[PDB]
Design a protein around this ligand. Sequence first.
Ligand SMILES: [Mg+2]
Ligand SMILES: [Zn+2]
Ligand SMILES: [Zn+2]
Ligand SMILES: [Zn+2]
Ligand SMILES: [Zn+2]
Lengths: 97, 55, 78, 391, 178, 82, 49, 124, 245, 98, 189
Amino acid sequence: TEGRSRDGGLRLGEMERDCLIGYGASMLLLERLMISSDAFEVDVCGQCGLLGYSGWCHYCKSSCHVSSLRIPYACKLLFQELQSMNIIPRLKLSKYN
Amino acid sequence: RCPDCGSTELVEDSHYSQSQLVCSDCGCVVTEGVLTTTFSDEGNLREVTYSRSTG
Amino acid sequence: KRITTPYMTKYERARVLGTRALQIAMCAPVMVELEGETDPLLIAMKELKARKIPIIIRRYLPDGSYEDWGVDELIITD
Amino acid sequence: CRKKNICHHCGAFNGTVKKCGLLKIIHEKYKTNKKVVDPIVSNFLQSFETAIEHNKEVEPLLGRAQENLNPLVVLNLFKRIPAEDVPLLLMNPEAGKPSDLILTRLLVPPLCIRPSVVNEDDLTMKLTEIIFLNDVIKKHRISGAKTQMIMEDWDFLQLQCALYINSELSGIPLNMAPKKWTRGFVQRLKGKQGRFRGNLSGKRVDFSGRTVISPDPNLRIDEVAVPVHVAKILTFPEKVNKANINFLRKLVQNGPEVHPGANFIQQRHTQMKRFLKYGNREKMAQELKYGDIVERHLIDGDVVLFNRQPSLHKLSIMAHLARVKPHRTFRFNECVCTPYNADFDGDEMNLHLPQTEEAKAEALVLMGTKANLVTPRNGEPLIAAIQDFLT
Amino acid sequence: RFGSRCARIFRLVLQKKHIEQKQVEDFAMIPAKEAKDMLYKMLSENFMSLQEIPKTPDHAPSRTFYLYTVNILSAARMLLHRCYKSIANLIERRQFETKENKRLLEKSQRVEAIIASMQATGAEEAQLQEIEEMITAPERQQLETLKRNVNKLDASEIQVDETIFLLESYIECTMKRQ
Amino acid sequence: LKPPPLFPDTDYKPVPLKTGEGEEYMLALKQELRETMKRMPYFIETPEERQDIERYSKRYMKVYKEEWIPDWRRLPREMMPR
Amino acid sequence: GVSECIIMGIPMNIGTGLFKLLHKADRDPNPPKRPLIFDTNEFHIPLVT
Amino acid sequence: MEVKDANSALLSNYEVFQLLTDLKEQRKESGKNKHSSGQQNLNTITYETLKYISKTPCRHQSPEIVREFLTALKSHKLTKAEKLQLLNHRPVTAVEIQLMVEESEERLTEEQIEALLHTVTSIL
Amino acid sequence: TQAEIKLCSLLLQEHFGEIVEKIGVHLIRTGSQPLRVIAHDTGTSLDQVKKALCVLVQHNLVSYQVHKRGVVEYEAQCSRVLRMLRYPRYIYTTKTLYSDTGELIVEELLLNGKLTMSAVVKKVADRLTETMEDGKTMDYAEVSNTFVRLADTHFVQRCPSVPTTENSDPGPPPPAPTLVINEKDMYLVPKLSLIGKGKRRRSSPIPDDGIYWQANLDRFHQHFRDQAIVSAVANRMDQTSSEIV
Amino acid sequence: KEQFRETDVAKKISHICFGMKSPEEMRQQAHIQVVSKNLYSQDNQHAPLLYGVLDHRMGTSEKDRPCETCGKNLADCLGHYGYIDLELPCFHVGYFRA
Amino acid sequence: MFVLVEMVDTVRIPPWQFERKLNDSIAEELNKKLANKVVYNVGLCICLFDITKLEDAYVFPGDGASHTKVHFRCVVFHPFLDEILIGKIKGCSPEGVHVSLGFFDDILIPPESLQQPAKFDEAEQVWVWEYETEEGAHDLYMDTGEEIRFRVVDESFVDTSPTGPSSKEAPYTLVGSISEPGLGLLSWW
Ligand SMILES: [Mg+2]
Ligand SMILES: [Zn+2]
Ligand SMILES: [Zn+2]
Ligand SMILES: [Zn+2]
Ligand SMILES: [Zn+2]
């Protein structure tokens, strides 16, 4: 939340985002902007490259090609609205080696 | 009822800003964090009479 | 043979201290005797001062080939 | 390809297609020219004899009749397109095909992105009015009504769908022009408060604090004096291991009220949290096992990022080693004033505490004060003595 | 697909190149509240093209006349596409029936091969009745049911090819190939 | 409230099919053809693969066929089956 | 790009994110193989000519 | 997880018995940690297999006598599967030998059947 | 043309199977392409691709062309993929206009893709052994008569001939033979006098080498158009008018 | 005894493919179709309609109600899509230039 | 019967295991992970056979547990069709006789595989036997019995993967044959 009547927590405005890039740090800005702001987990079906739920791809009627993945909530919301406009991001994933 | 102890001494309580429900009998959280509206959408709020909503 | 600079860049120091502190946070064995300090980062700094950390850097050149340096053979500086 | 005016495959002459009106397209195939009259228009124009006979306004504008295009006509034309032409049209065939380019069915976003109260969100109103129009137009065309107003309803439908995407269109006629602003998809994605500028790039964080600042020269140039009250709130989850076991036991016993204390516990296996206010005993301290994490208060020697709100250059945010002191304001040595540009005439400053061991190490090494005495613009020293020390 | 009256209204339009609802109704006494709705329906089928001359250059709906116009070549084309989808989904069903029944087919073919085998060798006659006691015997009528179904599918496919000839011939002849 | 059955009632129903000795002959010919193109090298089924174990029987029921070769003068000199 | 990695919540590809670390474990790569008794090659000969 | 070869090789019961005995030497040498169900799973499967093979004729064999047996059997032009079945099962009468070889009567003669029976009874 | 593409696919599956269907659909979806890129995109063994392509070119479903820089381009004609549906029609009309010998001639010619005079007449005679028994014998004379009648009546057309190597491009041969079609010998049947009595399945060198022949689909279609016109007139006016037509 | 399944599905993003959706596939994805104009039932329960908008098959935004498609609350339900058939085909603004 | 199959996989090792030499740790982990379970395509895994190749041990960011990849081979239970086998009985049934292999039990001997003369019992589930001259319909197969001789004739894998959104038969099956002389109880032969 934002206010002081409501609870707060300050903003990492875009100028700070550059500052953190500047030093050359990498986990710090990941932590500040994903672990402790809107950390969230989803699942996707690798065959169709689109998100599902509970390890069950409603599109494919299967549970084999599903996988779980961590993603900022605001990014998940972005995928939904874009799909809502029929602009479907069919994301592609692989092993993390 | 408390899953750890089965009692019913649960009392809703808040830390400095964390709303939570704690089994006061044994100190075991069972429901914490909530989601609420914001003042940014407060000025955007409208109203439709339920009769008009029901057609 | 190895072509890169022989010193340890600050970024390498940072990521080595970070990952070793995380490893000692979980109950890993410590390679240097400790006098009673109970903060992972300071134990990791002491270990590096003793140059006993079991971590090998892998420097990827842009094309795809790589070079390996043990954290004991880089010239550590201030 | 625009240079070619006839179809080499079938010799057919085709005119220019032009937007004849707002959300209206026409094909200029049947156009008269200043040169010799084309046979196609010669045969086309003569076909309006019955209309000219019935109505007298046909003849003056018989030459304005062209080939108009509509979603049914278009869609049934592209459904026949040979596949080999698709790649030339910069279409990835795996991405899709021209028929899906014209829409006949619409998704509706899940409830999770629309709150119960915007009473309901504009999308809900937009969807409800669209379906309402759909039902009335289908049953009313089933009623076999007049042409003109059936197609006018069609146009109104199309217009609503357009506005359902984009709320910034301004070509609407006066007599049905909207009288208030509404948020389309582009409105909430774009703008200063949009997703990109408002929420993705920069976003709010927790484990943070804010207060007035006042000086304290009796501290080293790489420390800050966080107040007790804020120290009791911000925490850092430690893991129990063979080195720090006794220390965390003393913290657990002190509880959540004495300063060097803790505020929660998590068990290694059972993910349930344990709250030390209602501990009912110190036996929680005895039952510590390797793997449990204790959310202790902030104590001396933790690493906390200090930041001045109007950031300009990367030296406005630096990592300081904290000490707890009893008053109600952040305090730091004045030789550090020049980078931050602070002025102690009532300013305020932010404080952040990272929640990881990797991020702790990273903040200390790259961002520390002792490693930032010189600015990267030209290599000059910033952190030096200031007024009243020079004197 | 629509009865004699629909064939009546169209061929009216084929002869009367340009016409509107009121003339159509007058010329065929297609009753009010019947011609218009049907005119909207086979408009939806792309069997009829709307010319829509203007009363004003804006071509506004209140300033236009809804002249109807035919297009034989486009017709012949997407009827032909209809037929193409026709042959496909038949083959789909014929194959669906074949693959669903394949288990019983092979179960009956193996015993039929057993009956047919070692027949000229002079083996004893105590096999014809003793093999028929199996469950497939009260399933032969179902096998014949499948057979006539495939037969009935195939006959329609044969026939559909007979239309295809006319469609393909005309779309070819009307095509100048330049 | 309730969207219809997936299968709405229609008054007009498919026109009845033909029958006759000629149509039956064409159906028989169609059956013959669908039975025929399975029995020559042009019907390139997948080559046999993945034997299970060294069974002795393989000496007998092995399928033997000639390596089909068209008039090679009529094709490019790039796809010799050897 | 740095911005893309940010909005996708993955580490950026510069600074401390430019090299990989390994564990200096005591391990024996490609250890000596387990020997076998029955299925040694010399005793298999195809029956077909 | 990825399977590379499903039919790479076949093994004798002696080899698996030797392997299980080696594991047993690496078994009960220290206190069970009871860390996870894997302990129980492995102990049950290994002990069950051990007890099953404790009642098999392959017991008390050795690599070199198996090698000599196989070298001698080489001259009989049997299939490897047959050979392995002989070593595993150790037939004692010709009645099961008839079932054992494919085309047993046609491929091999009565005297050759007696020779193989003598070989299995003597060498094993 | 997705519906058509599916029709091609299912016809290839019905008539040829899987790998042939794969290669066919890929080619009709990609147009003229050289062998290597086709094999790359498909990813299957080049032997299977080669085998498929030669069986399709044998039945004229696909063609190959010498292209710039000496590469060979391979193309498939989609229309030809819709002709096996009319094979019963071709067989019926030839049976109506010619005896069962002509029916078998057309059957062999279609199912073999191409055949030579000696090969087709010999194969027809051999297969007819299932049709005649009780000591009846079959000689190539009547088979040849029926085929020459078919060819004269335009129902059977000659395939393109290979060019003469010693007369054109001497030395190393080009990648592809670049066949040439000749029109003056279109219906010029080769001459032969060999006769062989059919073997009745008892289970106990080409004078016309290179002279391949194939069914004239255009003639069949023209005949079908005539039949349709005659039928149209019969329903229209009268049988006498239909006979005049 | 039971057949083995892999216990981990950890993976990393590599690419994002953009595109549009075909209507048959769009319907296949959608859970159900919304068909009722109105929002809430006439009765004083303020309940949403069976196949109207706001049907909890789509998800939830009320702390005390679980989702219908999956028995999960606000913090747990991911959200579900639905579709509407339009009788008369239309144009789409963004692609209109295309 | 026993088959050795090649296998590759990636494994994680928590930090406290660093004291041990890496191969033995990875071996015991791989064993607990694989042992005493069945694969839908190759049969029942018993235990690892050997570890062939090892890659470099990475330490991914966000974790302190070294990751590594292994090439290894394992021994799997997978009898082939028409294989002879000896196994105890475990229970009679109208659809056949159930046979136990000690560590595996999903073997059925159907009445079609059983000798023709005996087709049903005297309402007692214990399967009885009948011959021509001797064995006057008085011999019967005990639910435990000896390790009867039989030859497998059928086998099948059945998948039991979860279906639908989250929130009993064995997946591997075999059939035996006992008709031929010499098969069954050794007391008969
Ligand atoms: Mg100030
Ligand atoms: Zn999927
Ligand atoms: Zn409790
Ligand atoms: Zn054209
Ligand atoms: Zn849900």
